[PDB]
RNA sequence: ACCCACUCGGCACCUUACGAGAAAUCAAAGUCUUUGGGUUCUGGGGGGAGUAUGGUCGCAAGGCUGAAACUUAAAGGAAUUGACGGAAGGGCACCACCAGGAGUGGAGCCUGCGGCUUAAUUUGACUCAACACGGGGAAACUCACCAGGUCCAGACACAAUAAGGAUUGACAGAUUGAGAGCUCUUUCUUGAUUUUGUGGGUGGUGGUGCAUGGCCGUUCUUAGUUGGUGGAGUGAUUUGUCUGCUUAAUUGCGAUAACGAACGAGACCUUAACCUACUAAAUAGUGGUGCUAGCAUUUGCUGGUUAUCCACUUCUUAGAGGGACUAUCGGUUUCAAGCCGAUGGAAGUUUGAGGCAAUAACAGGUCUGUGAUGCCCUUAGACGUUCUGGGCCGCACGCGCGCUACACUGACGGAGCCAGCGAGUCUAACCUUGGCCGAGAGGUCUUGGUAAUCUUGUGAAACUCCGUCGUGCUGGGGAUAGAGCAUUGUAAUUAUUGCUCUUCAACGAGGAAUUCCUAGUAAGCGCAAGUCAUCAGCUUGCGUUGAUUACGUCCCUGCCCUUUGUACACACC
């Protein structure tokens, strides 16, 4: 054939960063649990799923995309 | 190759066929293609009786070398047709006459 | 096959047809866990296999 | 001198073979394993090699005498079958000619191939047997090419990673052609489905048709192939299977050490022809009667009426039969097969046209029809696959199939008005009548049809008819080109198609060459089907109008046949 033209810079896939997951369950003083990271109100998300926090952003990841809640 | 074919021609023939035919084509242990015919008995090849009396089937036998082609041809005895022209259109059979007793002066009988 | 051994071919081929003619003639006169799987899910459909409560805040 | 009979000794020839030989053949090459008349000479697998060396003869050239080492499994003889030949003798054919017809080759365009150009212009095929072929009419798709973007749809096994998370997804923003979370910013989500690595698979219009199947094309518009009994040969083999005649034909007659047979040809099968004979038919049609309109009247002539009834089967339809067998007669010939003429017949060219078609051959074509396949390559920055766009159409030119024409046997405008083979919509938008709107293309409202029922009588085209034009590139011709309107489709730009006005080129019957064809054929002419969303200048079929000239021959060409030669048999590549 005509093997190997390839202008450089191959692409990587993704990482899914390590991120030892939620410690964001705030206790006050033994042993009340004040539950940082407010949850979503979609009936398919039974309040066990939470909301991410970016600028102008409270996003539900359990909804693969749906229901952009804004507060 | 011959034993398997030659035996099949024998079982078909032993089963009351008018004729049989086996073709093996392809490559078999050599690099070059060859093809054999194994045919014993009577077989017609042209015309409508083909549709009537000969049964053709080809199979592809896939082996570690390549793929051979099995072709089989069986010619059924048309006398046993049981729903058909009972013979080949060539068959022109004459009935045989019977010996006669001559002159025997008139001598008419009565009833 | 080489024609130098052709005799031994027609004989072992005939012998094959001999065996194929005996198997053909000997086979002419020869000698519950019900449980309803489609319904076992409707039979074992009894309760005590669920949990549902949600909707805080 | 000649004739006839004989007999010696000559040069030979003819037939036989008792006999001999591996055979070809041989009255010697016979009278040999039943091996002995006398005698001379030479040979002992093939090369090496008639070479080296010595001797000897010769003016020379060379003669006579004449090794070995080494190498090698064959060389050789006669015959048989093949295959081949730029040898001889015969045949067959409009893919040969003859007598002609209609042409192509010149022109414009259409189309395919080469060439050039290109990011790519994917590719197979190159004499008949590549080039309107791959059903190959590609806007996406197709699609193999090129510029770029995703995805795994990487089975399974072990190992690694890892429930403190193996892995999945994504809002917005950036980004990107893109409302692709492709990637990145941010950080929710996901739960053992994946990931990572190795082994092992998988896909591929990647390669190899010179590894194969299968299929097809070619030889073959041909007539060839084989076995039983017998005759010949030690044998492979041969005769049968053939000089001649005849045929489309190894089709027959006849001759005949052959006799009688089978595959292939023929038979057969399908289609187009003939039935006033059989069975019938509101999805086929006829007469009569109602019911019914028009013109004539003196009874008539010409229509309307999917059932208002009665009858029929000529036409139509398809079932079963019938018919042709080259019949009758006469010519011709070995009075054989046959062949030619006349009468009759629906039919007498294998009745016309097809389908099927033995044995064998080809390195013919097809891995790009196949989830047919060996092997090789590749397999995650992919030769997998999908998405976007481009390309297969690119244009100094060479070649092939075609289309349309150069006009007055014509264009044009009115008018007459006649076919046949088809196809046509279910979980659907196919074939479409009819009524309106529109110059047109088309639009819109409805309707019949899963069909002998509706489209459709497919009112097709040439053609026939009355006018306009007048030989002037003319009103022949319609390339090229501008402007406008519609249809197909997600998309029409490099213009899918259709309509309209305008623009009005080349081409005045075409060099050397070359194709096709013998009767409802040639040619002219349109139509249906295939392809198809849209696109036929292509193909496959169909009917319409309907000639001229052969009814012969081997000159050209192509191939079969013997004869013959061969040191070829992987068979003249
Ligand atoms: Mg036939
Ligand atoms: Mg002799
Ligand atoms: Mg001949
Ligand atoms: Mg002739
Ligand atoms: Mg001529
Ligand atoms: Mg000419
Ligand atoms: Mg994807
Ligand atoms: Mg792997
Ligand atoms: Mg590997
Ligand atoms: Mg494949
Ligand atoms: Mg080949
Ligand atoms: Mg092949
Ligand atoms: Mg090739
Ligand atoms: Mg002909
Ligand atoms: Mg012969
Ligand atoms: Mg036959
Ligand atoms: Mg009738
Ligand atoms: Mg007549
Ligand atoms: Mg080749
Ligand atoms: Mg194939
Ligand atoms: Mg594309
Ligand atoms: Mg092309
Ligand atoms: Mg062609
Ligand atoms: Mg006219
Ligand atoms: Mg208008
Ligand atoms: Mg309806
Ligand atoms: Mg004009
Ligand atoms: Mg003009
Ligand atoms: Mg001319
Ligand atoms: Mg069409
Ligand atoms: Mg085409
Ligand atoms: Mg010879
Ligand atoms: Zn949610």
In DSSP notation, C1-57 reads --GGG-HHHHHHHHHHHHHHHHHHHHTTS-------HHHHHHHS--SS---------
Interface touch A39/C55, C-beta < 8 Å: no
Q: How was this structure determined?
A: X-ray
- Apex CA A48: angle with CA A45 and CA A50, to 5°? 80
Q: Which residues pair with B46 in a beta bridge?
A: none
Q: Position of tokens 């083909």?
A: B50
In DSSP notation, chain A reads -------S------------------BSSSS-B---S-B---TTS-SSSBEEEETTEEEESSSSS---B--
Q: Are B92 and B52 in contact (CB under 8 A)?
A: no
Region for residue B26 given its phi and psi (left: phi exceeds 0; alpha: psi -120 to 50; beta: otherwise): left
Q: Are A36 and A25 in contact (CB under 8 A)?
A: yes
Nucleotide whose C1' lies closest to the alpha carbon of residue A48: D189
Q: Which residues pair with B23 in a beta bridge?
A: B37, B71
Q: Are B28 and C35 in contact (CB under 8 A)?
A: no
Reading the block at residue C32, the tokens are 């519950």
* Residues of B (5-24) whose Cβ lies below 8 Å from C: 5-7, 10-11, 14
Instruction: Chain A: give the shortest CA distance to residue C57, in Å.
Output: 8
Residues 6 or more apart whose CB falls under 8 angstroms from that of B43 comprise B18, B19, B20, B21, B54, B73, B75
With an 8 Å Cβ cutoff, the interface of chain C facing chain B consists of 1, 6, 9-10, 12-14, 16-17, 20-21
């Amino acid at each position: 054939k005509k093997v190997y033209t390839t202008p450089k810079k191959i692409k990587h896939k993704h990482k899914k960063v390590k991120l030892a997951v939620l410690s964001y369950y705030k206790v006050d003083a033994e042993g009340k649990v004040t539950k940082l990271r407010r949850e979503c109100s979609n009936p398919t998300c039974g309040a066990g799923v939470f909301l991410a926090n970016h600028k102008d952003r409270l996003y539900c990841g359990k909804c693969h995309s749906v229901y952009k809640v804004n507060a | 190759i011959r034993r398997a074919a030659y035996g099949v021609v024998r079982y078909v023939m032993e089963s009351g066929a008018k004729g049989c035919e086996v073709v093996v084509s392809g490559k078999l242990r050599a690099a070059r293609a060859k093809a054999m015919k194994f045919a014993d008995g009577f077989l017609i090849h042209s015309g409508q009786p083909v549709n009537d009396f000969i049964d053709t089937a080809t199979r592809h036998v896939l082996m570690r070398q390549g793929v051979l082609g099995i072709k089989v041809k069986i010619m059924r005895d048309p006398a046993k047709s049981r729903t058909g022209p009972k013979a080949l259109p060539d068959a022109v059979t004459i009935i045989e006459p019977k010996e006669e007793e001559p002159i025997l002066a008139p001598s008419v009988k009565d009833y | 096959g080489d024609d130098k051994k052709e005799l031994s071919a027609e004989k072992e081929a005939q012998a094959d047809a001999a065996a194929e003619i005996a198997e053909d003639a000997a086979e002419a006169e020869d000698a519950a866990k019900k449980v309803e799987l489609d319904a076992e899910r409707i039979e074992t459909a009894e309760k005590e296999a669920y949990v549902p409560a949600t909707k805080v805040k």
